Design a protein around this ligand. Structure first.
Ligand SMILES: O=C1NC(=O)c2c1c1c3ccccc3[nH]c1c1c2c2ccccc2n1[C@@H]1O[C@H](CO)[C@@H](O)[C@H](O)[C@H]1O
Ligand SMILES: Nc1ncnc2c1ncn2[C@@H]1O[C@H](CSCC[C@H](N)C(=O)O)[C@@H](O)[C@H]1O
Length: 263
C-alpha cells in the first residue's frame, strides 16, 4: 500500500534508487542520490557473479539497481516486487536502456517465489527483506531458487542492541512508517541465513556509513515538498518527515551487508 502511493516521489529523491546511502561519515559531501549509487556499488562487491549469470532482484523497486547490475557485470536480471505500478516503471526503464532482452520485472511475493529450483546463479536483496513478515521463509525461498554454489548479497537494517526507554517511541515510529516488519540484530540475522541453508561469507556493519541517510533524506523531502504534498497533505507530510527525523535519533538503528553461498 505504502509503495504504490509514494514510489513516484521517493524514486527521484535518489534518481531512480529507492534505498539509503553510503557516506564516509556525517562530514561527507556526497549527494543523497550519489550516496545511494555508492550503496549499490558497495553491495555489488559482495555479489561475485560474472557475465551471463542470472540474478534475481528481490524487491526491485523501479529497477535502477537491477539495470546497474546488468551494465556493470553483464548479468541477466529478473526483478520481483508486489507493486504492479513499480513493475511497469521498471520494465520501461529497462526498455529505455535497451536491456529488455536481459532485464525483466514481474510480480512476485518473495515468500512464495514463482520460479523453479536452482534457476538463478545469484540473488540480490537491497533493503527489501525487512518488509517480510516471515524473513526466514524468504531466505528459504531464496536458497531454493539459488543453484548449488549460487551467491546471495543482502543489504538491510539491523538493531545493534536494545533501545533505551527515551527512544522507544522513535523506534516504533520508524518501524510502523518504514514498513519494518522484521528487524533483528546481526547475530540473529547471521543465524537465519544458516538455518535457510546458506553458508555465510561476508558480514559488514556499515551502520555509521548509512545513519546520515536518515537526516539527509528528511532534508530532501522538505526540498521536494512540491512533489509530496499533493499526495499526502500537510499533516501527512509533516508526519512522514518527522518519522525520519525521529529515526535518526535512535543510535541502535544500524545497517549491514551480508554475503552468502549455497553450501
Ligand atoms: O511512506 C512512508 N512513511 C514512512 O514513515 C516512511 C515511508 C517510506 C516510503 C514510501 C515509499 C517508498 C519508499 C519509502 N521509504 C520510506 C521510509 C519511511 C521511513 C520512516 C523512518 C525511517 C525510514 C523510513 N523509510 C525508509 O526509506 C528508505 C529510502 O527510500 C527505504 O529504502 C526504506 O525501505 C524505508 O524504510
Ligand atoms: N513480500 C514482498 N515480496 C517482494 N517484494 C516485496 C515484498 N515486500 C516489499 N517488496 C518490495 O521491496 C522493495 C523495497 S524498496 C528496494 C527497491 C530497490 N531494490 C532499490 O533499492 O531501489 C519495493 O519494490 C517493494 O515493493
Amino acid at each position: 500500500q505504502m509503495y504504490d502511493q509514494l514510489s513516484d516521489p521517493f524514486a527521484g529523491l535518489g534518481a531512480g534508487n529507492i534505498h539509503l546511502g553510503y557516506f564516509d561519515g556525517p562530514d561527507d559531501a556526497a549527494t543523497l542520490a550519489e550516496a545511494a549509487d555508492r550503496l549499490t556499488d558497495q553491495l555489488i562487491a559482495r555479489l561475485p557473479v560474472v557475465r551471463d549469470h542470472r540474478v534475481l532482484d528481490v524487491g526491485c523497486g523501479v529497477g535502477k539497481p537491477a539495470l546497474r547490475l546488468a551494465g556493470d557485470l553483464g548479468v541477466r536480471v529478473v526483478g520481483v516486487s508486489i507493486s504492479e505500478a513499480q513493475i511497469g516503471i521498471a520494465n520501461e526503464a529497462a526498455r529505455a536502456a535497451g536491456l529488455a532482452d536481459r532485464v525483466s520485472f514481474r510480480y512476485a511475493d518473495a515468500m512464495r517465489l514463482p520460479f523453479p529450483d536452482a534457476s538463478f546463479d545469484g540473488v540480490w536483496a537491497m533493503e527489501s527483506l525487512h518488509h517480510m513478515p516471515d524473513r526466514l521463509q524468504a531466505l528459504r525461498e531464496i536458497a531454493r531458487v539459488l543453484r548449488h554454489g549460487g551467491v546471495l548479497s543482502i543489504a538491510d537494517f539491523v538493531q545493534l542492541g536494545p533501545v533505551r526507554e527515551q527512544d522507544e517511541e522513535a523506534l516504533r515510529a520508524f518501524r510502523s512508517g518504514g514498513g519494518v516488519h522484521t528487524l533483528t540484530g546481526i547475530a540473529e540475522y547471521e543465524a537465519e541465513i544458516a538455518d535457510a541453508g546458506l553458508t555465510l561469507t561476508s558480514s559488514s556493519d556499515i551502520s555509521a556509513n548509512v545513519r546520515p541517510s536518515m537526516v539527509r533524506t528528511a532534508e530532501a523531502i522538505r526540498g521536494a515538498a512540491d512533489a509530496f504534498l499533493p499526495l499526502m497533505g500537510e499533516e501527512g507530510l509533516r508526519r512522514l518527515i518527522d518519522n525520519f527525523e525521529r529515526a535518526a535519533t535512535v543510535p541502535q538503528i544500524g545497517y549491514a551487508l551480508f554475503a552468502a553461498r549455497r553450501s
